[PDB]
Amino acid sequence: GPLSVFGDRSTGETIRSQNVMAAASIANIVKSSLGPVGLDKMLVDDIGDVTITNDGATILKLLEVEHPAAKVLCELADLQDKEVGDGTTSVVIIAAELLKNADELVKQKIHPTSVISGYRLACKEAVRYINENLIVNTDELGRDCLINAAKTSMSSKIIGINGDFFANMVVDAVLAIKYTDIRGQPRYPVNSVNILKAHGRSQMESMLISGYALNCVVGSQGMPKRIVNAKIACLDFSLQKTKMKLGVQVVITDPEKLDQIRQRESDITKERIQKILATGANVILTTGGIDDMCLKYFVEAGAMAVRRVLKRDLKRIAKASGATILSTLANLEGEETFEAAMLGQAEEVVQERICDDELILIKNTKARTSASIILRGANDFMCDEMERSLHDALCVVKRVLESKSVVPGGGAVEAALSIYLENYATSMGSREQLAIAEFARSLLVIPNTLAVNAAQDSTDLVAKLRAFHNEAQVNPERKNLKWIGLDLSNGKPRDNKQAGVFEPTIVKVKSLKFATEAAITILRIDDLIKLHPESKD
Amino acid sequence: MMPTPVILLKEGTDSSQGIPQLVSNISACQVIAEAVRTTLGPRGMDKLIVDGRGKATISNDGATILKLLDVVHPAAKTLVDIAKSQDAEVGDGTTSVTLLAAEFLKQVKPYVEEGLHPQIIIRAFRTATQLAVNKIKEIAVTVKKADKVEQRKLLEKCAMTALSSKLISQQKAFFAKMVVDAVMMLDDLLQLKMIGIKKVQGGALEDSQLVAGVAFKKTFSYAGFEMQPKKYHNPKIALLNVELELKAEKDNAEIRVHTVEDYQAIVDAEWNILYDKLEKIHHSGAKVVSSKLPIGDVATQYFADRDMFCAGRVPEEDLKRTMMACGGSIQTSVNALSADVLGRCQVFEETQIGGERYNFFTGCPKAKTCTFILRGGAEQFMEETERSLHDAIMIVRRAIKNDSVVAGGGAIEMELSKYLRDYSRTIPGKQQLLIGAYAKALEIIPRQLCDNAGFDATNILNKLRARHAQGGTWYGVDINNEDIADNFEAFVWEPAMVRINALTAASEAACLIVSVDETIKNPRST
Amino acid sequence: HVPKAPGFAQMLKEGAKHFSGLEEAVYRNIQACKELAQTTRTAYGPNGMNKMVINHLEKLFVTNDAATILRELEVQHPAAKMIVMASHMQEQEVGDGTNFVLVFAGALLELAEELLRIGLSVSEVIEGYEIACRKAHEILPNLVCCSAKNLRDIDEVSSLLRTSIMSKQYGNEVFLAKLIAQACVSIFPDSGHFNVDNIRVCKILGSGISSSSVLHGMVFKKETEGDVTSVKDAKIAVYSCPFDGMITETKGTVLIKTAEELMNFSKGEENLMDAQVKAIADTGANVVVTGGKVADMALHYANKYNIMLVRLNSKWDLRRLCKTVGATALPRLTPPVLEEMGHCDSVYLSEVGDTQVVVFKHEKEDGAISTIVLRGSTDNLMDDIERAVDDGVNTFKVLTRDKRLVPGGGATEIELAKQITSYGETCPGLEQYAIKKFAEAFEAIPRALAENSGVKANEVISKLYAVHQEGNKNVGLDIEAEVPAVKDMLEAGILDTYLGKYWAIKLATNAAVTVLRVDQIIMAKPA
Numbered sequence A: 001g002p003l004s005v006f007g008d009r010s011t012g013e014t015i016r017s018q019n020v021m022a023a024a025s026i027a028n029i030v031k032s033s034l035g036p037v038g039l040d041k042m043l044v045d046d047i048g049d050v051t052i053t054n055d056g057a058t059i060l061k062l063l064e065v066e067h068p069a070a071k072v073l074c075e076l077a078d079l080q081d082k083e084v085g086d087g088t089t090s091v092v093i094i095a096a097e098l099l100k101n102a103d104e105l106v107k108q109k110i111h112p113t114s115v116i117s118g119y120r121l122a123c124k125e126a127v128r129y130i131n132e133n134l135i136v137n138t139d140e141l142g143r144d145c146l147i148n149a150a151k152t153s154m155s156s157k158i159i160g161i162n163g164d165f166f167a168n169m170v171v172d173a174v175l176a177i178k179y180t181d182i183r184g185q186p187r188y189p190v191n192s193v194n195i196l197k198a199h200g201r202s203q204m205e206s207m208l209i210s211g212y213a214l215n216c217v218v219g220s221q222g223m224p225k226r227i228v229n230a231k232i233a234c235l236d237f238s239l240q241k242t243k244m245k246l247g248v249q250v251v252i253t254d255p256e257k258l259d260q261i262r263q264r265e266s267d268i269t270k271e272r273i274q275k276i277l278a279t280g281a282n283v284i285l286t287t288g289g290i291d292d293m294c295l296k297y298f299v300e301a302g303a304m305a306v307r308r309v310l311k312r313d314l315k316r317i318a319k320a321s322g323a324t325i326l327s328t329l330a331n332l333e334g335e336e337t338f339e340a341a342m343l344g345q346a347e348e349v350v351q352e353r354i355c356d357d358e359l360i361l362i363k364n365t366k367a368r369t370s371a372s373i374i375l376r377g378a379n380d381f382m383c384d385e386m387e388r389s390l391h392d393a394l395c396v397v398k399r400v401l402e403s404k405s406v407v408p409g410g411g412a413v414e415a416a417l418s419i420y421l422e423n424y425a426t427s428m429g430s431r432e433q434l435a436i437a438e439f440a441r442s443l444l445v446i447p448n449t450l451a452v453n454a455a456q457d458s459t460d461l462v463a464k465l466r467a468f469h470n471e472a473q474v475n476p477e478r479k480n481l482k483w484i485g486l487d488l489s490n491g492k493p494r495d496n497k498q499a500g501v502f503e504p505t506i507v508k509v510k511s512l513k514f515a516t517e518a519a520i521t522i523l524r525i526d527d528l529i530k531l532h533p534e535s536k537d
Numbered sequence B: 001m002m003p004t005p006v007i008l009l010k011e012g013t014d015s016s017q018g019i020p021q022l023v024s025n026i027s028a029c030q031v032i033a034e035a036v037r038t039t040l041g042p043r044g045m046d047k048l049i050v051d052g053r054g055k056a057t058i059s060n061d062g063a064t065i066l067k068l069l070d071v072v073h074p075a076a077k078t079l080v081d082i083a084k085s086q087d088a089e090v091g092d093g094t095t096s097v098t099l100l101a102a103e104f105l106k107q108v109k110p111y112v113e114e115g116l117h118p119q120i121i122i123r124a125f126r127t128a129t130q131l132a133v134n135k136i137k138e139i140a141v142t143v144k145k146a147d148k149v150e151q152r153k154l155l156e157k158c159a160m161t162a163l164s165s166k167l168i169s170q171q172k173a174f175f176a177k178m179v180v181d182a183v184m185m186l187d188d189l190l191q192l193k194m195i196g197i198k199k200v201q202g203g204a205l206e207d208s209q210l211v212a213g214v215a216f217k218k219t220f221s222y223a224g225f226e227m228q229p230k231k232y233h234n235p236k237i238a239l240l241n242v243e244l245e246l247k248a249e250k251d252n253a254e255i256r257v258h259t260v261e262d263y264q265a266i267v268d269a270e271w272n273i274l275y276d277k278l279e280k281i282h283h284s285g286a287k288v289v290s291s292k293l294p295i296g297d298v299a300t301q302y303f304a305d306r307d308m309f310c311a312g313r314v315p316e317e318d319l320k321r322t323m324m325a326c327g328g329s330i331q332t333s334v335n336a337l338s339a340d341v342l343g344r345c346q347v348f349e350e351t352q353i354g355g356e357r358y359n360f361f362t363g364c365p366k367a368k369t370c371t372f373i374l375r376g377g378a379e380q381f382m383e384e385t386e387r388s389l390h391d392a393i394m395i396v397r398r399a400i401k402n403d404s405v406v407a408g409g410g411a412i413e414m415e416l417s418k419y420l421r422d423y424s425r426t427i428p429g430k431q432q433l434l435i436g437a438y439a440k441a442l443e444i445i446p447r448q449l450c451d452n453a454g455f456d457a458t459n460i461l462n463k464l465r466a467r468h469a470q471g472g473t474w475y476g477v478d479i480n481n482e483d484i485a486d487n488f489e490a491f492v493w494e495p496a497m498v499r500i501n502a503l504t505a506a507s508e509a510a511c512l513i514v515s516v517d518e519t520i521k522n523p524r525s526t
Numbered sequence C: 001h002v003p004k005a006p007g008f009a010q011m012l013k014e015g016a017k018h019f020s021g022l023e024e025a026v027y028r029n030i031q032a033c034k035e036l037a038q039t040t041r042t043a044y045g046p047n048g049m050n051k052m053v054i055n056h057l058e059k060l061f062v063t064n065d066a067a068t069i070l071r072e073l074e075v076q077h078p079a080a081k082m083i084v085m086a087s088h089m090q091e092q093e094v095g096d097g098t099n100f101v102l103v104f105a106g107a108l109l110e111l112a113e114e115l116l117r118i119g120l121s122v123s124e125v126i127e128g129y130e131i132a133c134r135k136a137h138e139i140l141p142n143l144v145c146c147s148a149k150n151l152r153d154i155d156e157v158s159s160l161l162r163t164s165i166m167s168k169q170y171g172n173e174v175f176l177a178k179l180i181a182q183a184c185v186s187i188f189p190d191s192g193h194f195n196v197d198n199i200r201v202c203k204i205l206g207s208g209i210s211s212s213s214v215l216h217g218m219v220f221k222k223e224t225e226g227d228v229t230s231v232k233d234a235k236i237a238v239y240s241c242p243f244d245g246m247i248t249e250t251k252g253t254v255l256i257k258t259a260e261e262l263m264n265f266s267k268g269e270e271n272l273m274d275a276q277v278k279a280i281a282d283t284g285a286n287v288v289v290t291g292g293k294v295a296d297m298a299l300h301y302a303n304k305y306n307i308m309l310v311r312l313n314s315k316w317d318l319r320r321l322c323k324t325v326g327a328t329a330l331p332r333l334t335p336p337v338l339e340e341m342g343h344c345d346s347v348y349l350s351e352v353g354d355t356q357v358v359v360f361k362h363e364k365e366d367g368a369i370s371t372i373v374l375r376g377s378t379d380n381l382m383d384d385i386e387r388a389v390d391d392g393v394n395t396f397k398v399l400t401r402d403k404r405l406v407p408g409g410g411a412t413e414i415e416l417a418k419q420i421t422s423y424g425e426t427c428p429g430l431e432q433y434a435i436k437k438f439a440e441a442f443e444a445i446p447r448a449l450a451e452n453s454g455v456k457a458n459e460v461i462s463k464l465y466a467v468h469q470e471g472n473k474n475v476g477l478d479i480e481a482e483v484p485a486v487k488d489m490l491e492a493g494i495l496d497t498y499l500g501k502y503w504a505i506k507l508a509t510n511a512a513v514t515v516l517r518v519d520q521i522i523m524a525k526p527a
């Protein structure tokens, strides 16, 4: 008679109501961590680890989910870090409210393919309207655009101070790693900034190290820990005793030739260490291993040798100091040449005190003048929060300098799109106009969440918010009310042009493209079959 | 991990707080509204609920379905009590009260998640309800030519729509004619105990009938009932409350005798006590005897020899209907029997309807009661037919004392959305998002008339909002044709107090769900 | 390996715990009573929220009154029971202000924790609270501005009863004020004792609150067992014996010795019952109400002589019927009633809300007793209006005992916060800190009124002290809309229970003092 599957089958409006409650179970979590009045959470594990964070990606990655519609919204937050980097609480609330308003349409016996086709006409029109209603590029504002866009990202986190201490350190970090490319591409690789953590003084003592901050120790306590006018030798091979390979064995037939082979394992080893040290090299960085026999040659000659450094840290030092990453001997059948003209340069390599640990600093690197940020917090829970908040702040200034276009934040984009799409649904709307009209109400949840978390008036402040944006579209008298946002500290609509509340363009363009595409896949689960777990057979 | 005291809070109780509590109450009312959602409209199906004992009850009434779900949710019990009060006040407002009260919470469900302290929602719900129950009274039509054939036609149209959405398809013209004729035979009290609805298994719905008199089920008799033939052209009924047995003992009598000459005189006196009571029933014309107390083998054979009929162990609910049918009086003592206490009928026979025997009375013109015998093919089929009969009786019971009727279907629920949206555009403040949300919540009654049979319900609401804003105010949803139609001209009528008590009970239930902010449950459940 | 700490001096219990000191006993009693103050803080005021409380009997109670919530919550903390029994004494004394006790004594213990952790011990916070409590009873007669004396009729008490109604029924403040005005004034004893037990509530399930009314009489929920339901003369003979005859007491045994005594016993018993029913029919009686059962022979002659029978199974409802129609329950069998007959106007039956009721409706002589017939959509709604009805009857008994009133709505607690602070600054001692903390407990009572209205309590409490500059003494809170700009309470008419404010301050002070006296707690094993 029925289906003889050994799992479970649920059809109809059961799964159509379960996917909305699965998406609302995720959105109601992250609704309390949006905007400058948002608050952080606690993520306690079974082993006892506590993670205090408010970013939309760190919470949903550590949180376990079971529903298939819940894994779509959790993987939607992971894509926002790679594509944009701060846009990762706002996408989850929009994509869940896109399913909440579309559930009210399919309960009115409206076909979901008209809602899918109605959402594509509203998503492509939202990108078209936001690209024709921008204020200015990065020429008029200058450095004031980079600082004000950085403070908007920090307002939802622990580094949202009233001053410009953390804002100036981010702009000075991205501007110091300007790496040009072919065909006129000024790239800004923000992954080259080594963000370090140390439980020390307050947040106002966060050092901006112009150069690189290596997270390693010297090793042997007989080397000079401060070298002025240093020459960095970046190399990746273990400075240990000469061990033969698997194909080579030592089969001796004469007992007199025994001790000459035993001394040869250290003579070939020390032959490399004397030709890399006679060329003026004082700092040697190694990703392999330097044993206790080879540490004597640096104490005797007065050189610094750092062992077991990361491979991702050696590439950031050799590119910034002009050093060449050498793995072995080379240069056309040469015995030991080392190409001594390709040594790195540094002004000062100094191991400072980082509150009961050792940290090596390189000052200005003499070639590229890179930057590294050492964070200072109260405990380890604040340092993990300060690292995530700084990494999201580095991604904001990266997209502004690459794509010179900013949009007003604080719900100013979602207020203008809530009224333009209602007029867009009336012109060319015959049967898909109800999906475009619900696309505007789903976008209004971003200024609605700012009024809930601020404990302000909800149905009056957003009603006063769209009152200025309606007069900016139907009354062409140059009212300039396209930048009207929210003042959550006062509870009144303010102008985000003069207040300095700036967000990048692709933090909302890619947010509206990812949330609309995720809402289509969850809208097509009218039939769902769940099989039994095959564990013990 | 937070609460770890030495002395706990109360015992172990959990309590939600704030905005997650209120959405938990609104979404709970949406689940219990699905059990009355598919039972609306003439194209609405019924539901079958089986309990733990295995008893099946198939019905579509809101007062029958919601009482068998065994709902233990605190907020969802509010929608069950308004379905019970609608059956107690009106009788046919049941599925519409539960579903409309759930829409009052779902239309404010995006509003309660974003601010909007609920004292503004309670004030807006009470304001829109008082304007809704006043526009019904100002538009409900009435007549000034009653006590004629036109008033009986008004009672028949309200009973056909009350018999709609039931298990009756083509028997609307047959059953609803009997419902109007049932309440017109009653007195000026309209008591529901003055009409017997008895279910006889076997026969179609066309085999049912409305007896002008009464009829009982012919309960357990004794030897002598195959005699006493059932042909009476003008009998008299003796309603009694006495025992006609030889063993009538007062349970405290000790008859101490001394000799054998007086011992036989006691046994002869015990037969003379019973035979003197039978001589009082005799010599008075009372050929039919009815008593709620049992009759032994002695008085059964005495009436068979004197060509008299009797019936013992009659239920007390049937003797009260028998007293108002024949116009007599129940006499406990047989010494005061006369012509003023006996009944009078014309046709009294014992038929064989459905296999079981039934002693029916007919022919009495001064009949203040009636009996509607139901014939069906199943026990659950006749229980639904009895439940559908009570909804048509309680509609026509209230229609006599208040003949103000309105249009059926979604005609009133759509035009109340017109008068409330026009009122919401004339007041400032936050009430434009609440009075207008109250008007959009009333549009689900024409939605469930269409969603149960397709009908393209999105396009049919654009025709309803355009017709009510242009011309008449009684345009609703046609069931046979997939179009809008004037329900007042199509004789789809319902009394005005059906929708007045529906809007009043749904608003007071919706104001109670939004007013509770904490729910504390004690774990002691024994 | 790992050692452990054993018992030291008096560990002799078999599973019981022990508390001693300030941190283990005194500070934990404060934090337990603070959780009850924060629980009922949301349900306090006219904008309070209801609470669906389920007891151990698995039934639902939804209300906003703090007295009926604590009766269903199974509280197990011992110091938390002291603030519950103090609120239960407010219901027994005046019947209103039970929640005022949880806010004031919850703030008295909370501010006492700030004094024990900064300063003086319990020997001076208790003595400091008692000085400010005696001074608080000297300002309350000075804050009386109006009185319930002139025109004691249904017009003046319709406005003086709105404050007790709007605190629990905000939208129905106009309908319930008129229903409590036509019931409490109609049972006036002509300058005597006002009994609150003479007002009953008949819950009839049906339509909404607009169809509720007050009937001058009593409404029961039983049947007739007869056909004489239309009674217009209404001469009621009330009996307490079972209306089935006169039986003996010890054993009871019919002794038959001949055939004549057996045949005449059944006919002689019917003639004996016939003479007793016709003895009350010749006296003009129409309604015969009994307490016990009624035999079939009594029902035979009740319908013959055309008299109505009423069955009352409850013995307490029979005594209320004697005060309704003015009769006397006779313990013996039916006599010729000389002067203890009842006299009503119309006794009939009607099925209202699918419930056949018996109504003893008085038409001309209206004032003997009153019964408010409440209508509701749910049974849970009618229990909440009944609590609001009983708060209106209990407020009418307060105005009988003392006709003085004080302006509520936050106006009284600010003036009590200003005068106690004036006494605290003029006290040259170390106990002046507890006097200043006693006035701040009155400051938190209009704070709960503003937090329940969605208004910021910092700007609300700042405007109250700014307009109380030594001569106003009447401005309270305007909770009708946001951005309040608060108005006068005498112009709005928000003033209630001066005697309620006199007892709620005294009970909450003695409750908070009794908690601070507890220094050592010895509990037993719960079983």
Ligand SMILES: Nc1ncnc2c1ncn2[C@@H]1O[C@H](COP(=O)(O)OP(=O)(O)O)[C@@H](O)[C@H]1O
Binding pocket: A033, A034, A035, A036, A055, A056, A080, A085, A086, A087, A088, A089, A090, A091, A151, A152, A153, A155, A156, A392, A409, A410, A411, A450, A485, A486, A487, A488, A501
């Ligand atoms: N000063 C401000 N005024 C108003 N709104 C602000 C201000 N600063 C930040 N916001 C709002 O707070 C929101 C924070 O979003 P966020 O959680 O950072 O997104 P994501 O999770 O993608 O990084 C932004 O959408 C922005 O509109």
Ligand SMILES: Nc1ncnc2c1ncn2[C@@H]1O[C@H](COP(=O)(O)OP(=O)(O)O)[C@@H](O)[C@H]1O
Binding pocket: B039, B040, B041, B042, B061, B062, B086, B091, B092, B093, B094, B095, B096, B097, B161, B162, B164, B165, B391, B408, B409, B410, B445, B449, B477, B478, B479, B492
């Ligand atoms: N002939 C008809 N045409 C259109 N609609 C009808 C017709 N007959 C009944 N209806 C609709 O069916 C619905 C039945 O409601 P019902 O379930 O009886 O309410 P309740 O449960 O309160 O008795 C009514 O609201 C009415 O509008």
Ligand SMILES: Nc1ncnc2c1ncn2[C@@H]1O[C@H](COP(=O)(O)OP(=O)(O)O)[C@@H](O)[C@H]1O
Binding pocket: C043, C044, C045, C046, C066, C095, C096, C097, C098, C099, C100, C101, C163, C166, C167, C408, C409, C410, C449, C476, C477, C478, C479, C494, C504
């Ligand atoms: N119209 C009004 N305006 C302002 N405040 C009011 C109004 N009506 C009542 N209140 C306030 O609501 C509170 C209700 O207190 P209540 O809970 O009745 O105390 P209790 O529990 O002792 O009866 C009162 O203290 C009063 O100040």
Ligand SMILES: [Mg+2]
Binding pocket: C096, C097, C163, C164, C165, C167, C168, C391
């Ligand atoms: Mg009160």
